[PDB]
Write a protein that binds this ligand. Structure first.
Ligand code: HEM
Length: 291
């Protein structure tokens, strides 16, 4: 497969900045969701899960096609709970019917990180909706009950190296696990809708204990009331991962710059951009615009 990026006809930066503004204003308004965490976290999880289906070997899956809109993908066990993020974006898609689904799902993730005080994420438009038969089969997204070797091998299919995987995983500072969606329960930290390097500091500074939860799965729990998945805890068990965790725990700016590069790469995997295509857009926040 080749997936060539095609700009929505006649649209420029100013049109996309209006879609960003609509998502950001609604994030401000629906602040009570999930005990006042807000929709910011489920929106960056949605942008990662529509992108994380990509296979570098045959160029299938990934964000281009907007195939989460189809039943097979939408009903994947690994996507349980993302329906909330889908329902959030739906009124926004009726308002701007010209934007492709893959561009809207990915822009939601960008908007959420920047409005939660994260780094600026350069974004490119141009994903094109593809038919229901291009929808990837279930089972391409990662298990949680595994170790650091599984994590490295899994992220190689998306061709992410060690630094990219550890930067990407720092998004677990946001939101929480939900027992009814995944069989795991708890937040990774205290400030869970503000984007910071807190995930790394908790992983190094808390006294983690391995326990079984009410779904019979194992997780690491701390005295503070936080948790870590076996796959998160992996990052301090592997020697290569652990040096990078320490680096981000001591330098949030370096974490912001590497998360920015890795997240853009994740959202663009599988897509060819022509030389004539616009440069990446850097959207202004509501605050930079006085809105
Ligand atoms: C080996 C990798 C990963 C695994 C196994 C994994 C697994 C999970 C699980 C089990 C949840 C909780 C779901 C629920 O019950 O609602 C979760 C949540 C989340 N994930 Fe990950 N994760 C991984 C990677 C990532 C990456 C790469 C990102 C983003 C760049 C990410 C962002 C999020 C966010 C923001 C949430 C919170 C969602 C909410 O609060 O509803 N995750 N993850």
């Amino acid at each position: 497969l080749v997936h060539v990026a095609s700009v929505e006809k006649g649209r420029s930066y100013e049109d996309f900045q209006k879609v960003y503004n609509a998502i950001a204003l609604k994030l401000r308004e629906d602040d009570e969701y999930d005990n006042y965490i807000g929709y910011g976290p489920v929106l960056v999880r949605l942008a990662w899960h529509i992108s994380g289906t990509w296979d570098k070997h045959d160029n299938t899956g990934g964000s281009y096609g907007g195939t989460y809109r189809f039943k097979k993908e939408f009903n994947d066990p690994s996507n349980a709970g993302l329906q909330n993020g889908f329902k959030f974006l739906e009124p926004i898609h009726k308002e701007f019917p010209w934007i492709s689904s893959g561009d809207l799902f990915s822009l939601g993730g960008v908007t959420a990180v920047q409005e939660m005080q994260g780094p600026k994420i350069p974004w490119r438009c141009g994903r094109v909706d593809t038919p229901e038969d291009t929808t990837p089969d279930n089972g391409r997204l990662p298990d949680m009950d595994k170790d650091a070797g599984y994590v490295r091998t899994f992220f190689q299919r998306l061709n992410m190296n060690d630094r990219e995987v550890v930067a990407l995983m720092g998004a677990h500072a946001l939101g929480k696990t939900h027992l009814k969606n995944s069989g795991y329960e708890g937040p990774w930290g205290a400030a869970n809708n503000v984007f910071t390097n807190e995930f790394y500091l908790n992983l190094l500074n808390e006294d983690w204990k391995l326990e079984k939860n009410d779904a019979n799965n194992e997780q690491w729990d701390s005295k503070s009331g936080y948790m870590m998945l076996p796959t998160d805890y992996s990052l301090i068990q592997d020697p290569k991962y652990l040096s990078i965790v320490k680096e981000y725990a001591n330098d949030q700016d370096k974490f912001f710059k590497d998360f920015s590069k890795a997240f853009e790469k994740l959202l663009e995997n599988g897509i060819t951009f022509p030389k004539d295509a616009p440069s990446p857009f850097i959207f202004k926040t509501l605050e930079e615009q006085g809105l």
